[PDB]
A paper describes a structure:
Lysozyme purified from duck eggs (DEL) has long been used as a model antigen as a counterpoint to the enzyme purified from hen eggs (HEL). However, unlike the single C-type variant found in hen eggs, duck eggs contain multiple isoforms: I, II and III. Duck lysozyme, often strain and isoform unspecified, has been used to advance our understanding of many immunological phenomena including: antibody-antigen interactions; immune tolerance; complement activation; germinal center B-cell affinity maturation; T-follicular helper cell differentiation; and, most recently, to dissect self/foreign discrimination during emergence from B-cell anergy. We recently used a combination of mass spectrometry and X-ray crystallography to unequivocally delineate sequences of all three Pekin DEL isoforms (DELs -I, -II and -III).
Here we report the high-resolution structure of the remaining isoform, DEL-II. The DEL-II structure comprises two C-type lysozyme molecules in the asymmetric unit (chains -A and -B). Although the overall fold of DEL-II corresponds to a classical C-type lysozyme, as expected, in one of the two molecules of the asymmetric unit a surface loop of the B-chain molecule (residues 67–73) differs significantly from the A-chain molecule and from DEL-I and DEL-III, which are typical of the classic HEL fold. Centrally located within this loop is one of the four residues that together distinguish DELs -I, -II and -III, position 71. Arginine 71 in DEL-II (glycine in DEL-I) mediates interactions between the chain-A and -B molecules: the guanidinium side group of the chain-A molecule stacks against the guanidinium side chain of Arg97 of the chain-B molecule, hydrogen-bonds the side chain of Asp101 of chain-B, and it’s Nε atom coordinates an adjacent Cl− ion (distance ~ 3.17 Å) held at an intermolecular interface. In contrast, the side chain of Arg71 in the B-chain molecule is not observed at all in the electron density, consistent with this residue being part of a loop that packs differently within the crystal lattice compared with the A-chain molecule and with other DEL structures (loop 67–73). The neighboring residue, Thr69, contributes the only direct hydrogen bonds from this loop (B-chain Thr69 O atom) to symmetry-related A-chain Arg14 atoms Nε and NH2. These DEL-II B-chain molecular contacts and mode of crystal packing are not employed in the DEL-I crystal where position 71 is replaced by a glycine residue, which, in the context of the DEL-I crystal, contributes no main-chain hydrogen bonds to crystal packing.
Author numbering: 1 to 129
The structure:
């Protein structure tokens, strides 16, 4: 599923992402925009044999188990396939776990490079949440 911007913003608000551990909602929408283009089925295979999965491009070394990645920690305690669901609930739970660590949203390269320093509140403008 490719979400629209406001659809995603509403779904993320519903699941408690707005101002979760210091990151306002616009940060989460911005990150999803740049990481995946709002696409729950996005996948990108990395140089290290890990794959990034779903709308927030969550990585299979550290966070989810895909049975294909050396040295995998599976810190979210999930199969990576749950991160390709049209329902974002499992991805949001895992994202909250990720962002709890000292890296914060720097876990998401596209957030670090594309969203950090920008007016992220623009991502929720005009939306009914
Ligand atoms: Cl915001
Ligand atoms: Cl949670
Ligand atoms: Mg990416």
């Amino acid at each position: 599923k490719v979400y629209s911007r406001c659809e995603l913003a509403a779904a993320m608000k519903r699941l408690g992402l707005d101002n979760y551990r210091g990151y306002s909602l616009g940060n989460w929408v911005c990150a999803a925009n740049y990481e995946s283009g709002f696409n729950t089925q996005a996948t990108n295979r990395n140089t290290d044999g890990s794959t990034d999965y779903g709308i927030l491009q969550i990585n299979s070394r550290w966070w989810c188990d895909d049975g294909k990645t050396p040295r995998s920690k599976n810190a979210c305690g999930i199969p990576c396939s749950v991160l390709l669901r049209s329902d974002i609930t499992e991805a949001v739970r895992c994202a909250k776990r990720i962002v709890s660590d000292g890296n914060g949203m720097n876990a998401w390269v596209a957030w670090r490079n594309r969203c950090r320093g920008t007016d992220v509140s623009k991502w929720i403008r005009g939306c009914r949440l």
